[PDB]
Subunit: 368 residues, 2 copies
């Protein structure tokens, strides 16, 4: 049911005033664009995700897109009513996934025949929304009925609403934020440092054959944990038969606890088709984020005219609930039709990826 | 006004079945040990701490020990009533600080004339309390009026109360836990990875002048943030003129935001007298922690008779509210005299290290009954 597409720009100016030549990003869409091009809902994807917000590329895919549970016929993001479209970001974390098309440190520089590495220009949330704007424009679309996104994708969505206020009628921020505050910028740095310390990194110039695999796995382990909760780790801890006094980490400083070996293996398996530098660039992109990318959060919220719906996860330890509450109460103070509802499950940040359906009615009522 | 002392054990068995020779740990004490040795209050110290719970070694020390505000004459922990003693952990993180005395990776192995590196045996919190016990025994003490400690210090404290019930009349746990659950064990593992990724680490066999400095700083950055809150970082960012679109990290992948530069320098500063391998070992000793060191916390709680006070910080992100609650509730279901008061401040975990005084009276009344 899903066909992967590719959007290309020969020229593109980054928000930081750099040039990327030969941009290529993947994208996909579900449903039908109506005649007025007035039923467009942009899904903007989270830190490690891609355009694959729903559906499957192949029957044999082990699982559909991450928001399949609320995107489809008759679902809260109804594909019988909306042309639902999603775009791979630049510097997409899954640079070596056969379905992900991105421009970033792995792209070949024609000028050396070698990957850009850390020669790639700094990219931002705005750069993502601007690549999405160009894709939309090239499809004759001038307005968004809604933009919807979780986590890093809620940054894109709220940025859209702020940067192009006449372009967005509705803004759904899920497990989200209006800014990367100093707490969040610091927290996200720790995802980056494991890769800088890996000896293979070679200041970003490593080959694919000598990639910084350990630093990447180390980053994902930290990410994976930040995105969950004590509850989740203690329950999987139970399944592993976790104990404080395990003979292996007790006897050998170089062995680890059951729960660590699990997280390491999981993150290693999650990072096979990922790229270390691309993780670095998405980190920096998040650290630079503020709705509207103007002086501060208040200025960016003053530009929004879309009604706003904020769905924090109550358990979220990564983009914590006060983030959604900050943007939401700043908006109502400006007489923005702003609504806040909570996700309150046990997966923490990942409630808003894996179980956004819990709030499907709020999304639906917002979208009627 | 506080003399740093040394305790020595020619031979020490570890909890993991191994030997360490020339065990040397630092300690100090405040107050006067009564004729009965019944007024002994042991302070056990947190991850990056030392024995310096109060007072100053030199009156021109910039800052007194980390609990001077509640340990001293006439304070909640009255050092004209109690004898207040505190010992440096094995593998103490402050491996190059002139006041700490410890034994670990940087120690010279007398068998080889060279450092232990990661030949040092794995240490646990049990090994910390046992070195304390050995010190207390060397001093002729047989019983502790109170064992108190924040964080890793509370791990030692509740361990003391579970492994040696009659030794411990009262146990005060501050910003602490009964155990390192799976969440917390994985969480501290992230403290360890950056050190081990650093090329200079060399599987633990680096010279002091060829240390994995950038890995060590990485760990400390994470630790520092884990110990704090958004409020602190956001007040801090505001003191720093933090903006989200700062021109330095926007123009250059290799530049960083204000907050990160602050965080990095504070960690490189905190790391001057620290050793990397010792950090690995304290992390592992924390992952191995369960009060008592049985197969679970319930078994470790079941043998506690000391009356217990718990003082978690509501805003703690490192050892969150629930770890104290899980232990306090377990003890109350065992009809153990267990109280729980909360620190409400916004420094998170470090409420219980730098602002314990907010519960001075609860501690005072728990000690004075």
């Amino acid at each position: 049911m899903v066909e992967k597409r590719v959007f290309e720009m020969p020229h593109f100016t980054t928000f930081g005033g750099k040039q990327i030549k030969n941009v290529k990003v993947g994208w996909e869409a579900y449903g039908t664009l109506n005649d007025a091009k007035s039923n467009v809902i942009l899904i903007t994807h989270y830190f490690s995700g891609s355009s694959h917000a729903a559906g499957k590329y192949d029957e044999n895919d082990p699982a559909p897109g991450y928001w399949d549970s609320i995107i489809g016929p008759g679902k809260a993001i109804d594909t019988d009513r909306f042309y639902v479209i999603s775009v791979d970001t630049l510097a997409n974390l899954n640079a070596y996934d056969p379905h992900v098309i991105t421009t970033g440190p792995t792209s070949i520089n024609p000028d050396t025949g070698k990957p850009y590495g850390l020669d790639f220009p700094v990219v931002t949330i705005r750069d993502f929304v601007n690549v999405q704007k160009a894709l939309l424009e090239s499809l004759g679309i001038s307005k968004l009925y809604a933009v919807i996104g979780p986590s890093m994708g809620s940054m894109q969505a709220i940025d859209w609403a702020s940067a192009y206020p006449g372009w967005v009628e509705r803004m759904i921020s899920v497990i989200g934020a209006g800014q990367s505050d100093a707490w969040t910028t610091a927290a996200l740095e720790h995802w980056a440092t494991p890769i800088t310390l890996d000896k293979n990194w070679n200041n970003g110039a490593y080959s694919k054959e000598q990639a910084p695999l350990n630093g990447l796995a180390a980053s994902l382990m930290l990410i994976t944990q930040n995105a969950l909760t004590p509850s989740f780790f203690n329950q999987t801890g139970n399944t592993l038969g976790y104990k404080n006094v395990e003979s292996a980490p007790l006897n050998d400083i170089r062995q680890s606890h059951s729960i660590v070996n699990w997280l390491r293996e999981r993150a290693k398996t999650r990072a096979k088709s990922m790229d270390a530098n691309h993780l670095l660039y998405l980190v920096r992109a998040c650290q630079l984020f503020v709705a509207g990318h103007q002086g501060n959060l208040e200025q960016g919220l003053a530009s929004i005219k879309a009604k706003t719906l904020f769905i924090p996860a109550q358990t979220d330890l990564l983009l914590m609930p006060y983030l959604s509450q900050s943007a939401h109460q700043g908006l109502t103070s400006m007489n923005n039709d702003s609504t806040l509802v909570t996700l309150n499950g046990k997966l923490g940040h990942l409630e808003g990826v894996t179980n956004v359906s819990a709030q499907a009615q709020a999304i639906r009522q917002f979208l009627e």
